[PDB]
Design a protein around this ligand. Structure first.
Ligand SMILES: CCC(CC)(c1ccc(/C=C/C(O)(C(F)(F)F)C(F)(F)F)c(C)c1)c1ccc(OC[C@@H](O)CCC(=O)O)c(C)c1
Length: 250
């Protein structure tokens, strides 16, 4: 059975598409405002040297901080998000931050060379740049696998925006108070996505593959938090981060 998208569901898709267009800049025109990328010689992938310099940390912390501001902006426009208490809105935003960043970064990701290309060579990021910000292979290698797997789903913008919205509005986050309200908003989004796939995505299991990407994001989020914990033990690391990054990941 292929039920047609309701007027409410079409409205939700239009709102989410407009939300994304207002919060995502595909020209990466603000990148020159971040602290500059610094790429020291590190062919060996030396942990000692990486922690000593953290050369890419001010630039990547600014990029993530910027991306979180856009995610906050996006989330505010999700149908129903504003019906939640401000305590739940912040729990949802904090717990999902790195996952939604991983999803939205897929738009700039390219399988041509397995990089995140955000304009010129200065804003072209690879595995070696994430290690230069103090992260390790236990995070970057499944992260690249996730980017390729997600890129290969060839999501329509409609599916991409619904996936981000479903990620954010998740009832199974620690500290939520009204799980039932969060679940009702998420189901409204999940049903819109299933119906959209069935009636708009041409052949050649896409909904189940998208839900699997959400479970993959959970493991990546746990690895990132463990790595952020280690990176934060580096003396004077806080000056290389941002107040927003410190609060979200602290
Ligand atoms: C460079 C690769 C990557 C990939 C997800 C990234 C970058 C940083 C970090 C960690 C950083 C940290 O742990 C710190 F401490 F190492 F900095 C912390 F999370 F704490 F910040 C990780 C783990 C991965 C990245 C690439 C492009 C990105 O965006 C392109 C476009 O989406 C932007 C405009 C918009 O989203 O509206 C973003 C947002 C991130």
């Amino acid at each position: 059975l292929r039920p047609k998208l309701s007027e409410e569901q079409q409205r939700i898709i239009a709102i989410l598409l407009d939300a994304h267009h207002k919060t995502y800049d595909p020209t990466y025109s603000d990148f020159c405002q971040f602290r500059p990328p610094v790429r020291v010689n590190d062919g060996g992938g030396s942990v000692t040297l990486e922690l000593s310099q953290l050369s890419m940390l001010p630039h990547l912390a600014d990029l993530v901080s910027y991306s979180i501001q856009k995610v906050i902006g996006f989330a505010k426009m999700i149908p129903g998000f504003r019906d939640l208490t401000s305590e739940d809105q912040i729990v949802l935003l904090k717990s999902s931050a790195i996952e939604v960043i991983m999803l939205r970064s897929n738009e700039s990701f390219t399988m041509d060379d397995m990089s995140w290309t955000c304009g010129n060579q200065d804003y072209k990021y690879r595995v070696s740049d994430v290690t230069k910000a103090g992260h390790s292979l236990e995070l970057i290698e499944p992260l690249i696998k996730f980017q390729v797997g997600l890129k290969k789903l060839n999501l329509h913008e409609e599916e991409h925006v619904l996936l981000m919205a479903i990620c954010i509005v998740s009832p199974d986050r620690p500290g939520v108070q009204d799980a039932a309200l969060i679940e009702a908003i998420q189901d409204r989004l999940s049903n819109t996505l299933q119906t959209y796939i069935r009636c708009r995505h041409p052949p050649p299991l896409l909904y189940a593959k998208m839900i699997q990407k959400l479970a993959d994001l959970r493991s990546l989020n746990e690895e990132h938090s463990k790595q952020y914990r280690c990176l934060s033990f580096q003396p004077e690391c806080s000056m290389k981060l941002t107040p927003l990054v410190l609060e979200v990941f602290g």
